[PDB]
Amino acid sequence: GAMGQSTSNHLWLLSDILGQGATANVFRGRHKKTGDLFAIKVFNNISFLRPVDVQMREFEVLKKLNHKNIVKLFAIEEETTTRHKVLIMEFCPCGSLYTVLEEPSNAYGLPESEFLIVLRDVVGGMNHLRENGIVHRDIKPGNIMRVIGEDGQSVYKLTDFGAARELGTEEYLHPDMYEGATVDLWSIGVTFYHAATGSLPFRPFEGPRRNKEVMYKIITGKPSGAISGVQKAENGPIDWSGDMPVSCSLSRGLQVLLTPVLANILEADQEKCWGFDQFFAETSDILHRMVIHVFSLQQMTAHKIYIHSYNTATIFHELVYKQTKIISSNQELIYEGRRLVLEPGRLAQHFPKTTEENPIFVVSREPLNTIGLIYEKISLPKVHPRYDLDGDASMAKAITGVVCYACRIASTLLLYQELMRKGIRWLIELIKDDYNETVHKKTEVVITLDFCIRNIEKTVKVYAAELGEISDIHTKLLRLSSSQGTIETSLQDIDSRLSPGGSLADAWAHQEGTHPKDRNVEKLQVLLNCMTEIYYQFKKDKAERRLAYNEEQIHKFDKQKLYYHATKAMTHFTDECVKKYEAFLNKSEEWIRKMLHLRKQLLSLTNQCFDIEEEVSKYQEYTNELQET
Amino acid sequence: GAMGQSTSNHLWLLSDILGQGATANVFRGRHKKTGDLFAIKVFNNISFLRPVDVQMREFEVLKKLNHKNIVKLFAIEEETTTRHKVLIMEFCPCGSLYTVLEEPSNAYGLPESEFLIVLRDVVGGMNHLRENGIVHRDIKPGNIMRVIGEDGQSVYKLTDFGAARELGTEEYLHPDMYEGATVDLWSIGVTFYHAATGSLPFRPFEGPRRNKEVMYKIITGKPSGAISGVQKAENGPIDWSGDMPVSCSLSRGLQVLLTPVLANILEADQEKCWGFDQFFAETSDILHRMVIHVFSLQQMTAHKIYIHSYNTATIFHELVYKQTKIISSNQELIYEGRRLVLEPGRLAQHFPKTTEENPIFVVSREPLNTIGLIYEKISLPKVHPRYDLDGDASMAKAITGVVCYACRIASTLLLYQELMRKGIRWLIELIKDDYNETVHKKTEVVITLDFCIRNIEKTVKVYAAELGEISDIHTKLLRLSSSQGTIETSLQDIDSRLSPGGSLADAWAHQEGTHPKDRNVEKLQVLLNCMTEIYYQFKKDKAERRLAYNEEQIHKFDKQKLYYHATKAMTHFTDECVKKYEAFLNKSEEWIRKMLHLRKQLLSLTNQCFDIEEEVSKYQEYTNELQET
Numbered sequence A, B: 001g002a003m004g005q006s007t008s009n010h011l012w013l014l015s016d017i018l019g020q021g022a023t024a025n026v027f028r029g030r031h032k033k034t035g036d037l038f039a040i041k042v043f044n045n046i047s048f049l050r051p052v053d054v055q056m057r058e059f060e061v062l063k064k065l066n067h068k069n070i071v072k073l074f075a076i077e078e079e080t081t082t083r084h085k086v087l088i089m090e091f092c093p094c095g096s097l098y099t100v101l102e103e104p105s106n107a108y109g110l111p112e113s114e115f116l117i118v119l120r121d122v123v124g125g126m127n128h129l130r131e132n133g134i135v136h137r138d139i140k141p142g143n144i145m146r147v148i149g150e151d152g153q154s155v156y157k158l159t160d161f162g163a164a165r166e167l168g169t170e171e172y173l174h175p176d177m178y179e180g181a182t183v184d185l186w187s188i189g190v191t192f193y194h195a196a197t198g199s200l201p202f203r204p205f206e207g208p209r210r211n212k213e214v215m216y217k218i219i220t221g222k223p224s225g226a227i228s229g230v231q232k233a234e235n236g237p238i239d240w241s242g243d244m245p246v247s248c249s250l251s252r253g254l255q256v257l258l259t260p261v262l263a264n265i266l267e268a269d270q271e272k273c274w275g276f277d278q279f280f281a282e283t284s285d286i287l288h289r290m291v292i293h294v295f296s297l298q299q300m301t302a303h304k305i306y307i308h309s310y311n312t313a314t315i316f317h318e319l320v321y322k323q324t325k326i327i328s329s330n331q332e333l334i335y336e337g338r339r340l341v342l343e344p345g346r347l348a349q350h351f352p353k354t355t356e357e358n359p360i361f362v363v364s365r366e367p368l369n370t371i372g373l374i375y376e377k378i379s380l381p382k383v384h385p386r387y388d389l390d391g392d393a394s395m396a397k398a399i400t401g402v403v404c405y406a407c408r409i410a411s412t413l414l415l416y417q418e419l420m421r422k423g424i425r426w427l428i429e430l431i432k433d434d435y436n437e438t439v440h441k442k443t444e445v446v447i448t449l450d451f452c453i454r455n456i457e458k459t460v461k462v463y464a465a466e467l468g469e470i471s472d473i474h475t476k477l478l479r480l481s482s483s484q485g486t487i488e489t490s491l492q493d494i495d496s497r498l499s500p501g502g503s504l505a506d507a508w509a510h511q512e513g514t515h516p517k518d519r520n521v522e523k524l525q526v527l528l529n530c531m532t533e534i535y536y537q538f539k540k541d542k543a544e545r546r547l548a549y550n551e552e553q554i555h556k557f558d559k560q561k562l563y564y565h566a567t568k569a570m571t572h573f574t575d576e577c578v579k580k581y582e583a584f585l586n587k588s589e590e591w592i593r594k595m596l597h598l599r600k601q602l603l604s605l606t607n608q609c610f611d612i613e614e615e616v617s618k619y620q621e622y623t624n625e626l627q628e629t
């Protein structure tokens, strides 16, 4: 209950403070008449700078400017007493991209869906600024607002641009600006890398302090297209990389497209840098693509193939080969219990409905190594007995982010196993289908044969050289009957292999790994909830800047409680989730080999049935079609 | 920052108050040394009542008593100054069953999974009290605590029992106690009905006020086994029902089991009431059953069949018939793209993995009416301009509960449509399989025929009455060839029906209804989030008992905002979700009829192939096996 400023139609408390900037501040405020929430932007220190004439039109420009990706400026009013210039802005309750990246769940990067939303809204908003001719240069997660749309999905809105006339962020600065639309793409690139990785691209050991002199020497090199550079020791060598880290939660399909984009917008040289049209063209090319989910049983890996709606199954096979290394003519698709056949010129529009939980399976003929999920093994940071509020808050974010990652990995392990179980069941049903068809071909052959041998035996029965002619056939057809007999038996051996408890049964898989009923992920989430609660409390303890004797000891206790929670989670993750996954993968390799062996043998047997089929067509007309007047 | 009481090892604020009871109060408190949270029970008004000797042992009993379904009493201590008796109890941060039922999402009953958890924990806890001989009688959602388990699932713990010595809830009172373990089962029954329905079983028009005299006349009748009775007008007739209301979110399978249980524990007569062993036996019988998900394509209805692990497919078919009214020999199962065959003596243990999203489909031969989902059409309560805080809070709960229900129904409509789409695709693939097999039988027949007619034509060719004998066969086999020819053609007509754009294609279904990409449920949830926020704020406004001039107008605004949110949701629910569902159901009926027609015709054609197959076995030996020395 303290004093707050106010304007003829609006009012707000100074206690309610949204963001702090150099020129102005932003407060959570309400309209006087309707009581609706608005972001009130109050200029701090105005006097020398302010123009009645110029800034009038400057604000009159941003007013009528309207878009989905840009925060709406509704009006320009004066504070009641001080007559300060006050902007009435659209309020965004969810905060900004920074607020999103501060969540430990996004410590190692945004989810794929959410990252694409960011890429979409940012590009669209930045492009709308291009169409007006206004430059930003200051694009940072802090000035990228976030709201909840009608459809529940996040919508990102740009803010605070054009201060480059009347008047970039420190780690978002371009090397030369650190010392032209290139500077825009740089802040964009660092932002995009931050959203995908959960970390800045270029990090010195000390940090963005006085010792940030190293940062410039880091940015200066600009080697290759490398998208990141980090020194892991005080004043030492720099580790460069032109690829996303392992902890990244984006798909391989998305990374292959994203890496070049970040590579060309992140360098000092104006020679190798892009332009907004080129950038827009490449980014929009990524956003226009639909996603087909494909699980490779061979390697036990999930894949997101990014395809345009108008592309064909030809380019589809190529992309699948690019990820799974399976040759286009070796890819055998399976969808919902049955194999799937695609015409080489069939469009991507009419592809079957796909989800991560229901992908197009891919089994091959050529043997393949089971890779499984590749993730970065991350362990808990050491916890100090030190009482530092800032240190406790930062550590709380880090250690929770580690558990969030492990929880993420665990959720994927279960998905891989569950898909591995579905694909195996469909495959054995498909192999059973193949056995039945081969049996049908054998029944035809044996009928044709049994009919050719009887007709010839009836020929010698009723009605010198002739008995010699018919005897070659007797010897020939007998050899075919014996071979057909053996084939008939070894096929029943394959049926004995396909029978329940046949040594190719899928009984093992349910046994080997983890199941949704184990509720492993939910157990991690429980501990993650306790940790995230203690985390947000440590944030509020940081905000106070001090604590009472009571809250001091409660803080010291929950800090040790935060540790025991994390250790409990990681122990459960490694002992229960990982181990059972490993064993499932090991027993998956063996079944695959046995499965590949069986299919090869069945193929040979099927080929042999075709051979005896085409060899009895050359005899059933041989003596039965004898000629005379 | 005010005064709070404390004990040698514990301390607490009076501002932090968990629950208020007659004898005692409960505060949120912390341990002095470790700082861990505990529920502190402080006796109010003790003096005349208290026994040093008797109550010592009374508390010494509850101490060592330990269970998963009973709140743990850790110690008995004295307050520092007043020397009041203080119990140190296990703290339950989630609140109680009342707190759970106060959530608008549970306005029309708990979710099925959650209700079963309640039934489980309550029964187990009540039974553990039975084993010790302690009676409760006061069992109410208020004294049934809830905590979050390690596996994320709720765990319910009983509390506050045995006060029937030293010293039930008003609407939870037994008719005679309103004026013996029967009283226990009554409070249980009213509680269980409350959890499943979201409302009390017996409701007068005025309420539980002075005019609650009517309540006794309601309870007094005890007609039949009826589980509920409500008068909809002031001092008028009572509407009785022996079945759950339509708004209930429990499955038909669960209701069939639950209704009798609530029927036998809810009446005045000691003659027709159960006992704890009978109650335990029936409730545990329900809890021991596993659940098989089955979707009936014919009626477009989802089903939860409750089966013991040791039961067989015989009893399974019976239960399916009990719900879907499809005769046991007419039930054709489909699972993951392929039809499923079950041995009549196959146990329930080895049934395929089932979920609501992946059930065993059931298609029939006999025509059936498409019922679809049956739900209660609920509309928004009228909103008063009155400023009453209590009235605003109650109305806020009601109107949000209505939207929660509509959101629930909408989520199910999408599930039904999505399952309807999967079942159709699998069915047409299965019909294609049948077409292919019929084709195979025809190829055999035509080969046998073409081989019998040629051999006979070669007989007349080479080497009075004889030419007459062979001519009957010539005329006979010709008739079979013509009929086989016609069959061969109308089968290709069926193939033309099964071809894409064949008039039995499933193109329509995706077109007719709603899809997950429409994000209808997420849109409702957004509005539901705004409503539930204004709801909880109105609760806090109620708690204050007054508001400042500012908060008064903000309250008045958000009340009108609560209405526009709800109307927006219900409009979207009826116009967008319902309508598109209706049309999908209407176009589902037509496809079903066409599908049933096609299968009948294919059957006749398949039967005709068997006939010409068995009619050529009586001829191919007729003259070719002629006898002579």
Ligand SMILES: O=C(NCCCNc1nc(Nc2cccc(N3CCCC3=O)c2)ncc1C1CC1)C1CCC1
Pocket (backbone or CB within 6 Å): A018, A019, A020, A021, A022, A024, A025, A026, A039, A040, A041, A071, A089, A090, A091, A092, A093, A094, A095, A096, A099, A142, A143, A145, A159, A160
């Ligand atoms: O435009 C700037 N800063 C961007 C951030 C501060 N400005 C704004 N803040 C929110 N809303 C907001 C900002 C932060 C947080 C939250 N949160 C987080 C939790 C709950 C809540 O209300 C909500 N909206 C909107 C805006 C902009 C004014 C249209 C410059 C720095 C000072 C000027």
Ligand SMILES: O=C(NCCCNc1nc(Nc2cccc(N3CCCC3=O)c2)ncc1C1CC1)C1CCC1
Pocket (backbone or CB within 6 Å): B018, B019, B020, B021, B022, B024, B025, B026, B039, B040, B041, B071, B089, B090, B091, B092, B093, B094, B095, B096, B099, B142, B143, B145, B159, B160
């Ligand atoms: O035993 C009784 N009442 C039952 C309710 C009050 N007693 C208790 N309350 C919580 N915890 C509790 C009770 C209510 C609410 C919340 N909530 C809801 C939101 C956040 C929170 O802390 C937490 N635990 C445990 C207990 C019992 C003491 C072991 C009798 C009535 C007075 C004695």
